[PDB]
Amino acid sequence: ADTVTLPFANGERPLVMYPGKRPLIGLTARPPQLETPFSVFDEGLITPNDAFFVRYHLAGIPLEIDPDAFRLEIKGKVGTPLSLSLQDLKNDFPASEVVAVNQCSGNSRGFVEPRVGGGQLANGAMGNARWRGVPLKAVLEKAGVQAGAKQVTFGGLDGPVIPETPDFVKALSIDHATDGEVMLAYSMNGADLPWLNGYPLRLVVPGYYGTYWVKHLNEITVIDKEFDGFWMKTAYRIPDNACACTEPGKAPTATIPINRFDVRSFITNVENGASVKAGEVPLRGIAFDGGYGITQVSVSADAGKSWTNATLDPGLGKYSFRGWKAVLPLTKGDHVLMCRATNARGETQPMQATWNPAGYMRNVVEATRVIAA
Amino acid sequence: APLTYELPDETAQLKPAPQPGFEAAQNNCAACHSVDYINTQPPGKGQAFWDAEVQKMIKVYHAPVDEADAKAIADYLAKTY
Numbered sequence: 379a380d381t382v383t384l385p386f387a388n389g390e391r392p393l394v395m396y397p398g399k400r401p402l403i404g405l406t407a408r409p410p411q412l413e414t415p416f417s418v419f420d421e422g423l424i425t426p427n428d429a430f431f432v433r434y435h436l437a438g439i440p441l442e443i444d445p446d447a448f449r450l451e452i453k454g455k456v457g458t459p460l461s462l463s464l465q466d467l468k469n470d471f472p473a474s475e476v477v478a479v480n481q482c483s484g485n486s487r488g489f490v491e492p493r494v495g496g497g498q499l500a501n502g503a504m505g506n507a508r509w510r511g512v513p514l515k516a517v518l519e520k521a522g523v524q525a526g527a528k529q530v531t532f533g534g535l536d537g538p539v540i541p542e543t544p545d546f547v548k549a550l551s552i553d554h555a556t557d558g559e560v561m562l563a564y565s566m567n568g569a570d571l572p573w574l575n576g577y578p579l580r581l582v583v584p585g586y587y588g589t590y591w592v593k594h595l596n597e598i599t600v601i602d603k604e605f606d607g608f609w610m611k612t613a614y615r616i617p618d619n620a621c622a623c624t625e626p627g628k629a630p631t632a633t634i635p636i637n638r639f640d641v642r643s644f645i646t647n648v649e650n651g652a653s654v655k656a657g658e659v660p661l662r663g664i665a666f667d668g669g670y671g672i673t674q675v676s677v678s679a680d681a682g683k684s685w686t687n688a689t690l691d692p693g694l695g696k697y698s699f700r701g702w703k704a705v706l707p708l709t710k711g712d713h714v715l716m717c718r719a720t721n722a723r724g725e726t727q728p729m730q731a732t733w734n735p736a737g738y739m740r741n742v743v744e745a746t747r748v749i750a751a
Numbered sequence: 752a753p754l755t756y757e758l759p760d761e762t763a764q765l766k767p768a769p770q771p772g773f774e775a776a777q778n779n780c781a782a783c784h785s786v787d788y789i790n791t792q793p794p795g796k797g798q799a800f801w802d803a804e805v806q807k808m809i810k811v812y813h814a815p816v817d818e819a820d821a822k823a824i825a826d827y828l829a830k831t832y
């Protein structure tokens with residue numbers, strides 16, 4: 379009818395219907411936080427607009443926008459400040475396209491043990507889309523970035539209900555901002571951005587967690603220092619170590635802003651307790667990382683005792699989900715299936731889950747028990 | 752004309768309890784966001800967890816909640832969720 383239960387404690391959620399969306403998992407209403415049912419990820423490598431997850435921090439999201447009047451302001455340490463219309467962006471700059479995953483920093487938080495506060499998400503706060511727009515590099519070049527610039531800040535039309543609450547503003551290094559991959563996206567899967575995915579313009583930051591992908595983007599400021607806004611200084615911090623992790627229950631001694639994705643993979647065509655026919659069993663799924671390239675995906679049907687090489691599907695780009703397929707011989711009985719990816723710089727997935735106080739960056743090897751008969 | 756977007760009706764509510772913190776939470780904790788933020792947190796987390804949530808709202812997000820209400824609310828949440 380209208381609820382689902384996610385596979386962790388206090389997992390009940392409403393299935394909710396928003397304009398332009400299929401039924402999604404409602405986490406919060408004000409502001410909207412909507413998660414994608416896991417079944418979607420087996421339906422194709424590109425997440426449809428009507429299924430794409432939604433995350434916001436502040437209730438004052440825009441609900442009326444005149445696209446003709448909309449302006450993107452470029453200001454700060456630039457030679458010529460700019461006020462660009464959507465028509466200007468579409469017409470005055472050559473377009474770029476990239477197929478890229480957007481994933482919430484806390485995707486899978488609900489599975490973290492011990493549990494931690496925050497958005498209690500299963501694995502559906504991620505999606506893959508074909509984004510089209512203007513490379514940020516081109517717009518900043520037009521403005522003329524000044525020597526001494528260090529960072530670029532990004533803000534959108536949303537705001538807090540009470541003005542003392544910190545506005546949602548994020549920052550990138552100037553060298554990242556001008557790398558040619560960071561994009562001012564005005565199109566998602568060949569359409570104007572869905573409302574809750576940041577209509578009419580958003581920042582796309584391939585290979586970086588979603589907090590940077592500022593929606594309803596209208597203000598870009600080039601600055602000559604590190605930005606000290608709340609959402610960079612205090613929120614979205616990870617431990618400053620290789621594992622981005624601490625001993626369960628312990629705070630990090632040093633932190634840095636969250637940044638690039640770690641390596642993840644999932645089996646998408648079976649879930650816990652699924653039935654398969656003993657014999658050769660086809661498995662399939664996805665893998666992704668921070669944009670280095672998935673080198674291989676290995677699949678196990680005996681809880682990681684032995685591994686089989688999956689065949690990777692043709693790629694859509696280094697920032698996309700990478701599809702994979704494997705056919706494994708399964709004897710009659712229960713089997714714990716796992717998949718484990720590695721990328722082109724040797725990053726991989728841990729067999730045992732790690733922990734950090736915010737419950738960010740989960741990427742443990744996923745296990746799925748199936749029944750072969 | 753501009754384009755517009757319509758959100759569905761909000762229905763999220765706090766779990767009733769006889770503790771006075773229930774009413775205090777109703778009157779203070781829905782002012783910035785829906786109460787599904789509370790309803791969906793991990794279960795049975797206990798006093799320290801909920802004390803810290805309430806204090807964060809007050810100190811970090813500037814929720815205008817006084818000391819007595821802050822305690823009533825945290826106590827209600829720790830007992831109820």
Ligand code: HEC
Nearest residue numbers: 434435495496779780782783788789804805808812813814
């Ligand atoms: C505006 C001044 C707020 C008031 C009033 C209350 N809270 Fe809040 N809360 C606020 C913000 C800006 C956020 C982050 C939203 C996001 O999407 O990131 C939250 C979030 C929560 C949460 C989720 C866990 C967390 O992020 O800490 C909870 C459980 C929560 N808020 C509880 C809560 C309670 C108990 C309140 C009354 C004391 C309350 N909130 C009021 C801002 C504001």
Ligand code: MSS
Nearest residue numbers: 431432433434435483534575588589591593
């Ligand atoms: N404006 C804005 N933007 C923005 C926001 C907000 O809040 N606001 N959020 C973030 C986040 S945080 Mo975590 O890290 S993820 C995320 C993302 C999401 O997207 P979608 O909704 O489209 O999906 O977004 C991004 N952007």
